[PDB]
Amino acid sequence: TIGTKEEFLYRRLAIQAARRRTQVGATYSRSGKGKKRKLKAVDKYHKTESNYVAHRIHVYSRKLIDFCIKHQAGTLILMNQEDKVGIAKEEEFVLRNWSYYELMTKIKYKAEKAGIELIIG
DNA sequence: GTCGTTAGTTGTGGGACTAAAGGATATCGTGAACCGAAAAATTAGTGTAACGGGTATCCCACAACGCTAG
Prior knowledge:
The PDB classes it as rna binding protein/dna/rna. The protein has 121 residues and is mainly α.
């Protein structure tokens, strides 16, 4: 089992909540010097949670590939991924808090590199 | 003759009665009337939709050349 709900979803939502916090707090910040200085604090969260998500996705994909190679698993199958894509599409939280295209593409390129053939179903 | 003493009753009261298993019971009699308490049920009142830039994230597709001449 690679990844925890707290280290992926909860920290991602914490970064999002901090960004909303700064967005709310920027309305009454220093004013009269333009919009850019007001949104300066927002500018910090440029690619914060994107970087965090990318790093955790890299770690998780690396652990999956390492486990598959260490047990000589020459064919890695994603179970019920089509149905989960279908339910995620007709939702809001699942799409905007569970990067599955990024995970799938990292797994695909890191398994086509190691010879493992990836199946989706 | 009379009063305290001692021993032997005599009546009366308090305390015992293996170990092992199990272990169901039924339980009357009726006087009135008003006030207070709190617990419960019924009733009366307020409602959005898209929009400007600008920017955070998602899925989804594609690229990431090779050769010739001045």
